[PDB]
Design a protein around this ligand. Structure first.
Ligand SMILES: Cc1cc2nc3c(=O)[nH]c(=O)nc-3n(C[C@H](O)[C@H](O)[C@H](O)COP(=O)(O)O)c2cc1C
Ligand SMILES: Cc1cc2nc3c(=O)[nH]c(=O)nc-3n(C[C@H](O)[C@H](O)[C@H](O)COP(=O)(O)O)c2cc1C
Ligand SMILES: Cc1cc2nc3c(=O)[nH]c(=O)nc-3n(C[C@H](O)[C@H](O)[C@H](O)COP(=O)(O)O)c2cc1C
Ligand SMILES: Cc1cc2nc3c(=O)[nH]c(=O)nc-3n(C[C@H](O)[C@H](O)[C@H](O)COP(=O)(O)O)c2cc1C
Lengths: 187, 187, 194, 194
């Protein structure tokens, strides 16, 4: 089964989580794992002014999402929604929608946040879009700051540092668990 | 694989939908289907005053939910949430939660509504509880009044009549599709 | 303006928060503040065996919600929804809905959780119902620090952590935010209604 | 009171609804009403090829949102969320968030959909962001029939159906509800701010 970890990061928190998700997924024998990012939509000079961390993962196209049995989506919490970049990207998947291309495939969501709240709403509002595509939605439940909706990191914004070891463990779990389901369903 | 259709109905709309869901599930060779209701919490005299339709399906206990590979939950739209009866029932599943008993099992949701709106919020707010239990959430997507979140019936409240043939077809689809996934995952 | 703080509590956490909300509301001259609870639905023997806490607040009826200008709703988080007791109570507001009785009145929500997870969904899923009644929804955002009586969460409404075992009590930081919510909502109620 | 109707539209459906909202708002004496759009993010050539509609409204900046008492946000439904254009615009409100600039101001939301599905989630997921800014959320409920200029949906905000092919235009029933929303929000804005 093929697993895509697909993410948006501006300051590297989701980037770090994505690597952990992918490590977890790669523990599953039957699973082929790939990590890609959605495009940055901000002009590089605006990204740099804002202090962004340049992302180097390969860039996904909207249409290649069809190639995978499971897609694990990472986004920062942006006032309780996914980022504009992820939203712009998903707004480009209309052509898949029309064809059923993601129907029945597994979807799961991870996030990162400051200490203001909103991470639950980010994850569940991202589910909604995934449901329009007919994707099967995988929460993490009581595996575990924490939500049962998906892994999170609390990045205590500004002088910000880094995901905790416990946070990265839960992120690894989410990838291992999603990948295991993907192999059960698809070989 | 074992499939439970679990529902709450006061005026029979969800009752009618549940039968359709179960017909759909029963089309799947590997699937064993059972229909049960959550208890009515209103005193019978209060139910009758309100014009309720007496429900006769067997009553589920909260703990027997553990026996099934997939659970398809039906609730009327009540101001954009599940009914108090379904909420009281799910509030009794704490003992399962604690043990992981529903973790990884499939969950899906259907609803009924008047013409006021709220059906989307009823379905997605019910998902949230299912996620706390670690259940895998199955939307219906573009199979289809309609929502991709789950089957609905628009019961145009008062002088109310009945689910449409197209509505009942989508409800059958939801059971067939959920049951098919349950057999893929569990035999 | 008349402000109702309407709550459900099994183990006292929301009760403590309700009292805080009401204290904040009472700071507003011209706000008349009342605290009531929704009925317990569990048999008393079961409530007692479970260690539920007895409470002095008067029990609300659904009808009387019409008599206020603002209603601040408190509920524990039950798997990311309001409690079955609050849901069952709100399901008895159909007659009010049909007459418009709560339309345009102010509404706000507070919660409690064991370990954090779900609190945002509890608050926003309760907003849904408030919107069907046409109530004006008041989130708390991140208010100016000087408006809190303790020097310092969610923007959706005040919350408290009860711990995994239920033994934690609300901190003065948490209670300060609850007091702020009541004062802020009551302030708006008087601005709109005298 | 100053009321901003701030919208995104690709094919004109939300533009038509915005104009309706503004017409309703303008009925309130003392309400100063302004309509602006968020910037298009697609390259113009791609917008044109896709059949996007050109529009006269002035383009808003994020900063100027601070200058209003009420903001009524319009967005098409994009898989049950606001559009990437509105999301990208709101993600540029961090400086306003940090200064409190929108706190306590009134907010309300309207939408459009192709075939119905998702509209409720678009509106309530936009409320989330408004709450992070501490805005007072105004749903429309089911208002008294006599307040609509056409004799007669969701309670969360006005909506319109564009059809599967995008060719449907908003009905006078739908537009009446949009006009109501603007008049009702503007009325509240003047009650609160003069
Ligand atoms: C536009 C904007 C909105 C934000 N909204 C929230 C929020 O609602 N709650 C929160 O706690 N943090 C919020 N933050 C902080 C980010 O979620 C946080 O810094 C996250 O760790 C960044 O992930 P990244 O490094 O992958 O970009 C927001 C940041 C931005 C830029
Ligand atoms: C307390 C209450 C709340 C209601 N809320 C809504 C609503 O938000 N939107 C709606 O369109 N209908 C609403 N209705 C109507 C019911 O969803 C509808 O009648 C449904 O078909 C009943 O299903 P049942 O026959 O299975 O009870 C509500 C009804 C009740 C009693
Ligand atoms: C059925 C049930 C479900 C619960 N779900 C959650 C949950 O989703 N998240 C959580 O952190 N705590 C949860 N709790 C813990 C409660 O939120 C906690 O008991 C409550 O906040 C206490 O408030 P009270 O003392 O006013 O009853 C749950 C408790 C029960 C009984
Ligand atoms: C990426 C995308 C996703 C969409 N998702 C939905 C949907 O979830 N539900 C729906 O009914 N229509 C959906 N539509 C149709 C739009 O909501 C419709 O084009 C929009 O309401 C038109 O408003 P406008 O003319 O102002 O752009 C979608 C359109 C696009 C381009």
């Amino acid at each position: 089964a093929k697993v895509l970890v697909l993410y948006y990061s501006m300051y590297g928190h989701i980037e770090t989580m994505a690597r952990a998700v992918a490590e977890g997924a790669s523990k599953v024998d039957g699973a082929e794992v790939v990590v890609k990012r959605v495009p940055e939509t901000m002009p590089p000079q605006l990204f740099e002014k804002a202090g962004g961390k340049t992302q180097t993962a390969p860039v996904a196209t909207p249409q290649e999402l069809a190639d995978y049995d499971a897609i694990i989506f990472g986004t920062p919490t942006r006032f309780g929604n996914m980022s504009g970049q992820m939203r712009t990207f998903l707004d480009q998947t209309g052509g898949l929608w029309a064809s059923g291309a993601l129907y029945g495939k597994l979807a799961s969501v991870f996030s990162s946040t400051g200490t203001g709240g909103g991470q639950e709403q980010t994850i569940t509002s991202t589910w909604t879009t995934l449901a329009h595509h007919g994707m099967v939605i995988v929460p993490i439940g009581y595996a575990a700051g924490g939500t049962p909706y998906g892994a999170t990191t609390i990045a205590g914004g500004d002088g910000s540092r880094q995901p905790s070891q416990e946070e990265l463990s839960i992120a690894r779990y989410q990838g291992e668990y999603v990948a295991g389901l993907a192999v059960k369903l698809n070989g």
